[PDB]
Design a protein around this ligand. Structure first.
Ligand SMILES: CN1[C@H]2C[C@H](OC(=O)[C@H](CO)c3ccccc3)C[C@@H]1[C@@H](O)C2
Ligand SMILES: O=C(O)CCC(=O)C(=O)O
Ligand SMILES: [Fe+2]
Ligand SMILES: [Sr+2]
Ligand SMILES: [Sr+2]
Length: 325
């Protein structure tokens, strides 16, 4: 591989990472209180769980994975239309909601073995959808339906979380969930998986992420890494660094990475829901007391975002400046 993609020695993945047998698989068609309790325990203990029987159509999940794979099979001349000034965009503020192809890495500077298509999904209007990929022909109609369905499921999970925390229903149905970035991640085959990463170890900086995968490669940090079993009809729920802050660390954030594969490509669909850049983030005042003092001072999501996207010296570098008590 090009030296551009060689990860620092300490960040390289070991060849045989064990399956995470303790990753919760939560059936959302259980009794209401059982679902609230199981989600609450997974959020407190792990910060990563899968949901099944989640009410999002399996056919739509398959059609969305199909059109996302079809997008990454498009020729160079079509993909260039999503490369501003002839190169992929960078994950840096301002992060526009129009569709672009993105490159990503860490500044021992290296690049992740990944192409990412990203666009906003909420609210859906003509202007936003007209800024999505023109090809494949069905991308806009399928992904518009998918984005509405994934948002509906995310808001159901956030209300289960509200009941678990003792927050009013709809606590996150406001500025805290107004940005919905859909990241379609393409991991092409890699000649040297021992030296590369599809995605470096990170928290998602946002509130909550729903991740759809068909193939292995996702791993979670529990300094032990475990493999997250791909269930093609499930969503992986990753709690974001923003939710870790708002719950005053009552909930864990998911630290996860993606390893490369020597033989096969892989596509994942990540729906990253979180605050507008104008939001102030702080521990929910409703949950604080002398027994539970705030562990973070209030901060600008925009200010956090700049650090989160630039400084990868530690997983929570984004929130370190705002730590108190
Ligand atoms: C692997 N990378 C991580 C960092 C960056 O994330 C973002 O770009 C999100 C997009 O919502 C963001 C979150 C919070 C603040 C700023 C940006 C791009 C991708 C994501 O999959 C997660
Ligand atoms: O490809 C994956 O399974 C992980 C994707 C991801 O972590 C992300 O988009 O933030
Ligand atoms: Fe992620
Ligand atoms: Sr180019
Ligand atoms: Sr257009």
């Amino acid at each position: 591989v090009s030296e551009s993609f060689v990860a620092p020695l300490e960040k390289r993945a070991e060849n045989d990472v064990p399956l995470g047998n303790d990753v919760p698989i939560i059936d959302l068609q259980q009794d209401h209180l059982v679902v609230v309790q199981q989600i609450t325990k997974a959020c407190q203990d792990f910060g990563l769980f899968q949901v099944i029987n989640h009410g999002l159509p399996e056919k739509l999940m398959a059609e969305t994975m199909d059109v996302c794979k079809e997008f990454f099979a498009l020729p160079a001349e079509e993909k260039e239309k999503l490369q501003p000034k002839g190169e992929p965009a960078k994950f840096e503020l301002p992060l526009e909601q129009k569709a672009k192809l993105y490159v990503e890495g860490e500044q021992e500077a290296f690049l992740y073995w990944k192409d990412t298509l990203a666009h906003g999904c909420h609210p859906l209007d003509e202007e936003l959808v007209n800024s999505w990929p023109e090809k494949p022909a069905t991308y806009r109609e399928v992904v518009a339906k998918y984005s509405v369905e994934v948002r509906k499921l995310t808001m159901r999970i956030l209300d289960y979380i509200c009941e678990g925390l003792g927050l009013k229903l709809g606590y996150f149905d406001n500025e805290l969930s107004q940005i919905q970035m859909m990241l379609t991640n393409y991991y092409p085959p890699c000649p040297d998986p021992s030296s590369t990463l599809g995605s470096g170890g990170h928290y998602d900086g946002n509130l909550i992420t729903l991740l759809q995968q068909n193939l292995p490669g996702l791993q979670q940090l529990i300094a032990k890494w475990i493999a997250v079993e791909p269930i093609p009809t499930a969503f992986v729920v990753n709690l974001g660094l923003t939710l870790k802050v708002i719950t005053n660390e009552k909930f864990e954030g998911s630290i996860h990475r993606v390893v490369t594969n020597p033989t096969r490509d892989r596509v994942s669909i990540a729906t990253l829901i979180g605050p507008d850049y104008s939001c102030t983030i702080e521990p929910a005042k409703e949950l604080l007391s002398q027994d539970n003092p705030p562990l973070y001072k209030p901060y600008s999501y925009a200010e956090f975002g700049e650090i989160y996207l630039s400084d990868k010296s530690d997983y929570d570098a984004g929130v370190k400046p705002y730590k108190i008590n």
